[PDB]
Nucleic acid binder design. Sequence first.
RNA 1: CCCGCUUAAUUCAUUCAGAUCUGUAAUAGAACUGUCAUUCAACCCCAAAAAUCUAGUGCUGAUAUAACCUUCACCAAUUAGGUUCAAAUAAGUGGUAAUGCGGGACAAAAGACUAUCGACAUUUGAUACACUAUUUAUCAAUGGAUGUCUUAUUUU
DNA 2: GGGTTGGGGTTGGG
Lengths: 187, 1012, 184, 199, 148, 117
Amino acid sequence: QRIYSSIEEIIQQAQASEIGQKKEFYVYGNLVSIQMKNKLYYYRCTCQGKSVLKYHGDSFFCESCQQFINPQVHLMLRAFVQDSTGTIPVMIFDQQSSQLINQIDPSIHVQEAGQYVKNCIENGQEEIIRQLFSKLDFARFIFEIQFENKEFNNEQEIAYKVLKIEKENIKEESKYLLKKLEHLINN
Amino acid sequence: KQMLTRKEDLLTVLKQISALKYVSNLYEFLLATEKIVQTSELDTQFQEFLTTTIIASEQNLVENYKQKYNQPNFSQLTIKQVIDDSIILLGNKQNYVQQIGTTTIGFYVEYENINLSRQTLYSSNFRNLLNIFGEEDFKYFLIDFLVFTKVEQNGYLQVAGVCLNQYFSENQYIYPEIQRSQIFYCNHMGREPGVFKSSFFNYSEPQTIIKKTLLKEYQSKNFSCQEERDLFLEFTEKIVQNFHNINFNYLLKKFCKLPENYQSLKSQVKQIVQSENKANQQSCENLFNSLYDTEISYKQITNFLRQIIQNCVPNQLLGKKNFKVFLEKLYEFVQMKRFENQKVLDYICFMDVFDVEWFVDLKNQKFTQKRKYISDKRKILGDLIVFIINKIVIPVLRYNFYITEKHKEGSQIFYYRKPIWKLVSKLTIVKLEEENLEKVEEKLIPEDSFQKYPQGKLRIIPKKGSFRPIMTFLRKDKQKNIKLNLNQILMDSQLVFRNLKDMLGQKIGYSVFDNKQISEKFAQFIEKWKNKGRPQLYYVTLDIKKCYDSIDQMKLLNFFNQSDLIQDTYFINKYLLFQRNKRPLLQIMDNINFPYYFNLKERQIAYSLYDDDDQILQKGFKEIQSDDRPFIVINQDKPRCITKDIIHNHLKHISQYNVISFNKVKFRQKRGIPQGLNISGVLCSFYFGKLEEEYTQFLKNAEQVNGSINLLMRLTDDYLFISDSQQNALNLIVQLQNCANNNGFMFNDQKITTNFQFPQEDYNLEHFKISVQNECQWIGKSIDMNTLEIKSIQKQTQQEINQTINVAISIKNLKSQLKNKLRSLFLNQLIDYFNPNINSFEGLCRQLYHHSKATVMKFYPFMTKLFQIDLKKSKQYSVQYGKENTNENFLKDILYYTVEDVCKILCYLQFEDEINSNIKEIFKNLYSWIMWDIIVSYLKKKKQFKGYLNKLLQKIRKSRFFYLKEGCKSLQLILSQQKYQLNKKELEAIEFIDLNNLIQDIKTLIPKISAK
Amino acid sequence: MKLLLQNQNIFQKLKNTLNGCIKKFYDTYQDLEQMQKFEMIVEDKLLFRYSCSQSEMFSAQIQAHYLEKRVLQLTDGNVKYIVNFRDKGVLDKANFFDTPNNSLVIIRQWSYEIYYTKNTFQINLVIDEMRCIDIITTIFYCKLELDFTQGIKGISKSSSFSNQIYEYSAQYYKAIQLLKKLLI
Amino acid sequence: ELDIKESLKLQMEYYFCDTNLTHDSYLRGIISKSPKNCVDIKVFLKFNKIQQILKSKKDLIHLIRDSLKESKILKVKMDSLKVKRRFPFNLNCLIKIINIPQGTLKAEVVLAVRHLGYEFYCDYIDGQAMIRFQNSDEQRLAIQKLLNHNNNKLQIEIRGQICDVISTIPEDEEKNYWNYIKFKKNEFRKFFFMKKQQK
Amino acid sequence: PQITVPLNCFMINQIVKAAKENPQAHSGNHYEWYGAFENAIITAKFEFLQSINDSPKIMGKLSDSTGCIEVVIQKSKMSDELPEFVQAYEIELQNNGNRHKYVRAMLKMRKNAQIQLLYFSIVNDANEISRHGLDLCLRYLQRKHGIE
Amino acid sequence: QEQVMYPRILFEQMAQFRGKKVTVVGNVCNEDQNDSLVIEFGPTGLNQHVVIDNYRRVDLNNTTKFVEIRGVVLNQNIVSCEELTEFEQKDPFDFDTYSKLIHLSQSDKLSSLFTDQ
RNA sequence: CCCGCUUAAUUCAUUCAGAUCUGUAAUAGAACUGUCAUUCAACCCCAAAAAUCUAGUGCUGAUAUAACCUUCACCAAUUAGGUUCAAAUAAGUGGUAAUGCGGGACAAAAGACUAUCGACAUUUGAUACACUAUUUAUCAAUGGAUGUCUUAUUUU
DNA sequence: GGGTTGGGGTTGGG
Ligand SMILES: [Zn+2]
């Protein structure tokens, strides 16, 4: 069996943590408010190309492999994972975002989700993407949340990243609330 | 006709934009929707707010907001709750003014950044507006409309609606770019002539190695099949093999060889380097001059490059005729200026695809679809041409020569052999060490400044008899976690100093920074001079030598510390500014947008936390306007902070620990601040203003003690003084000399230019070389001492004019580029000194005559470059100008519309809105005729224009003359109707028109304006 | 935002103001009349008031306030301060957008106040003028704090966790020692 | 010498005289072919009597220029080699594809058949399309590829639909088609006669 | 210190009654139940109420095992349509032969004003009832023990 | 505009009440096949069958698998039906956690928020 | 002017750094090796102008005191002589290129051509393929096209 | 596993 913790405990433990510490949790929560103000995707090679050489006319060339590659689009989303107790900002990477898009729209295939988003954005169809992202509001899931205490540009900061997303089933959540309440009443 | 007006309203301008179907102020909208009635009473300030606020929408929604009898309007929520409800109603939309500085999380809105426009939204006026509207209508009014609230006499602030900057917003093949910029400024030298050891020519010593080094070109997608790749690889193998048989020593001796007295120059340089005592000035000037006359001519280098290419590249790689075309274009590649470059289509469009024999087509498209085959093979020909130039030509030029520009030669390009430049560098390093540079060791510099700031580089530009060092701070250190160069580190302190720059204008010295300030000072002095009665005038001009290197660091830091003009803490605001352009409003083809009338500029400002008069905290901007036309500002959510202590640390570091590099050797400045930093210009002016106010007390009270008019201005290191008394000029010279003696600086070349002559023995001025001239020349402006009129100085020959012009032309946007180029060329410097308060009518006409004569010569190379492209092969231009004479029609259209726009701008600058329209039309026609006469006279001799186009130009000129005469003829009858009463300026204009007899001809006025 | 408040360097302003207050108090009471010195020492009344200069202006975010005791809490990044304000007029003059909480303010002038209580000297910080410039609803988790409403014990706390608080506490103790030496 | 140069100049003037240049017109074509009626000395270098008057070619050019300098009929300036006057002085096997879909354009089918790479003639009628080659051997050099030997079917791809063709048209029909070609030639001749006879 | 809190109809009625009976509180819209809260979470069955001459406001009903409350649903003004989450309820109600079902509803309530309903989702598993009850009790205990 | 109390009870408290306006919840029974609808309590390991007379078994939706009713108990194992809702549940309904929740709601400490007094 | 072909040989010089050799008063001689670069190169301040340029003219009636035209390299500034809304013949500088060899009769108003061609050649259109300054294919309509000979003697 | 904003264009004063 796993251990489930609320958002407030994650917030309190993240602040006290020293620089360079990591820990993982499991939370019952609902996703809300995916943000689209920044760029929604980036480009990486199949051989894990650290540096992608930008060119003109949709031309590309990886440096970790040294071949003419078709650019591969990786989808990154920022949203908020909020429980009844609290709210935290999280980052959603390619696999989980593709899973969410496939769940909300079964027609799009898993790895094709990034291509679909890129085509919709570039062709001039942003209303469809807005409607697609709006249907994910207040959708309950099971999350694996990891916080990292790291320093960027000589500035201490905490970043939350989601590792796994699972479908919700009320039964063990109800059992967990019951046992927590029983422990509280006992003490 | 449509004319530019000095006064406009935002409501009138907004009605000219087709997107907005409803434009009105808030009061008339409130009455239109029956929210308020005229019998109701309101506060006077609330009434003013309702009257001045301007709203607009893309559709008419007056019906939707009509007052409903179902339920009245009472407010119980707070303004914040209503605004939050509106922002939540916005949802996923991301571009709204009220959304700036905040994010939405479900049904909660979080405020996280400083927005200076929230003070307007959360003000009492908007509370009263909410009371008037009601929540259910306020929440949608904030979204469906664009709300502009007036905060200044002509400035407006958008606080709601879609941001204005959102209105200011199948692929095709793009050819590669020639990397011509690589040739410049190479200091590396090798033992044996050739190319760098990292080039693929020297790495090889089979097909495997050449394939490995040339991966970028071997696996291109333009190759149809593997056979083409194999043929190209074999060609590259042959190229590499042939290159090693070139005797570079013989080629360098034959075409571009060293001087016959090279050994004497080398011996002289060595003796100067080794000698302990200081070298003679005249001998070193002669040595520098002799070194700089060893430059290689363009023909010599073109022959050298052609010889290299002919025996290194097989003739069949490009074709028998394509090779010759490439060789011929190589010369035009060689002689280009600093910021000029070639294009691949400059070679491709003159070549034949079918000339290449080794091209193979997988599918028989040679006969079926010839055009597709031609496109596909052009894609390969362009790659081959790029490969030849970038791999062979550029590295050889970079390795065997030092290519740079001189000091007063503009953008002209010069080539120097590498040993000559090594001698020059040795001599320059010897000269730099004695005065201001010393060799340094990294042990002395502490590690904090070593790991916090990046270092600079040194570059040498030849000068006649000397050099000109420039220090560049572009680099950033990958190690030590540095991601910015030094200027980017010092950017915010530059904003603080720019804040300091405004007070320097009048408070603590005589400093000028731009043309508007100089023009205002001249206008004030001219008014005082006219009031006095136009007496005789005397002027003195002198300048400081090496102002940046003559600054004492301790004095500069002491001045910085004890000055109260720089506050302890500053905040930084960012905002977008929309300002009217110089385009008149069209009077009501259907697609008219905001960019047609406004210019978008990104601005930053530093403000203090004190309760200052300017009260930037309420607005967030500080703009100076020269007219009554409106402008719009929208704030941004990126605030920053900067403290005086941080600026002090930056100044201390740059003054004490500046380290620069030259040929893998580190140096360090010993005195002064480096030129090339963004903060040095203001610091120099501040430092010299302190001394000049120390030593110029007598000027302050002289305007009242003895009643003498005098003007003193200083731009950087240049001084100008115009006075009425000779004693004042002599005293100023003596006082400035005393200040220079006491503060350790000196004036350039020991020269002073004056209007009079005085005995120099009495004032210990024997070492000065006084030059007497009757016509003042200052910062490129020519000033007359009798009539006191100012006009710029123009070059006289085509060769001198060409040196400062770089031509860049693209087929996609010929029309816009050429029209904007003409507009800038006419309006570059004439727009600042066309003041009616400085010059008279004849002076303005003469100024326009000379400026237009200069601008036509400036623009001439663009017209010749245009004729190198035939537009009959481009549908975009042939559909509009035909096929027979496309180029001539295009050029005529551009010239006509540009001249018309320039004339309109000139009339806007000269007259006020109160002047009668007939006078304005007459003067516009006169200016148009002057410019067209200049153009026709200049172009009537050229062979390219000799035929079809000159007839059209002459017709235009004749039409302008006829229209001017007709307007002058009808003006008499119009004025004789007595319906108009004429003021002083109108009477002056009538007198000017009648004196020169513009009714008949122009031959009376031409002698006065053409006089040189 | 947090970087904006850190660049202010409020601790330098506090140190300068405390140094000026101590110097002025030392200069103004050199009479050293024993009867007057004994008269001036009574329970629960202020002895001196030094207003800060115009150069000690900073901005902070209000996290909480208390009308009953006139205690106001200010935070900027790492450090949160607990100070007082003169009266409700200070809050009414500052045109708050919605509420005093979660609002960014500029303190135009403040002052140090010296009080003698329980056979020792207590130095307070009182805010006189405030100006609201925006709303910032962003929770800042301040690890460390200093309290100006409890005397030496409220300031010396969490001194080991930060060098700046250690230096300011040393300066505060030196000021208290000098005050008790001169007056008593 | 001076006399030799004078005689050569006289000979050149006689050869460049207006009266002589009309009857002969040997050098008149050279004059017409000149850019701006400025002929060089290469034309006179092929002469027999002019060369015999000579009794390093730049020296000969300079001598000719000196000889013609004092003359007025011709012109010489800048010590150039060219010359000019001072006056104008002007005055078996063929197949048919079958079962073409109705409404198919001629361009599509002619493009489809031209993929072989040799010229021919095509006419489209309802379905039937006669194609004729210019030489005998292209038929056999093309039937090796236009016949898909993998399927062994006389099939050609037109408009994305499979079309059929016969390898040999009937002998009577080829005779009729040759007679049709002869009839077309005769009708062109008759039209040519009519065009001549409208005047 | 948390604006969102889960509680049922009886607690809504008790809070409103207590606030109205003794209005001697701070001059703010916020209620007072072991702190200040704006939002609420409740699982109860939903049914439309057909009011008269009320176009902008649509009256609903949220009955539960403890009591009942009145809620109002706002609609867009630029055009006359219904929110998506309630259109889904309407179409499902039409499809299933007019059978009312429990919903998980989040509603924003302020004093001296009606109770807006912001969003709800139809629930088909009876385990949500026990989950909601346990969550209500746990959060109530947490709030009471955090006050002290 | 009306306050009606519908407290939740278990199977054993049903005899303790003996007539009150309450609500009960259970899985629908189909093996007995009465004319009147019969619902069942517990995980079916122990037999607890109650029948409602107002509501017919066949009229409700076929996909319905779980129901809860609100009505006064007519007699032991007979409950009148006033309001009935339909739950189409694809997962088993846990009865132990529901029993614990009911017992905690009936407790003295937490009864204040659930019911008056 | 166009076209065909060819156009030359040993070092003018060798910075910086490393490592050998010989000589001896710090000078110098000899030979050898590695080599753009923090993987980038690119000075700064102030000021001027800014359409998504298939979109824009009183499309122009004028001052023989005017506007054009003509010169054996090209191009651009300096003098004479003519003509009247468009036409043919000139005189001094500055700057830039200049290898040899071979060729340069269709001038043309035509005639005889029944030699040639639905596979000739244009003309405007349409349809495809192409478009950043493409050198095409088919169709429709339509009438001329190609070649040779005749008004012809290398003092050319 | 992400990360100021890189330009584009190049005249005239200092
Ligand atoms: Zn790769």
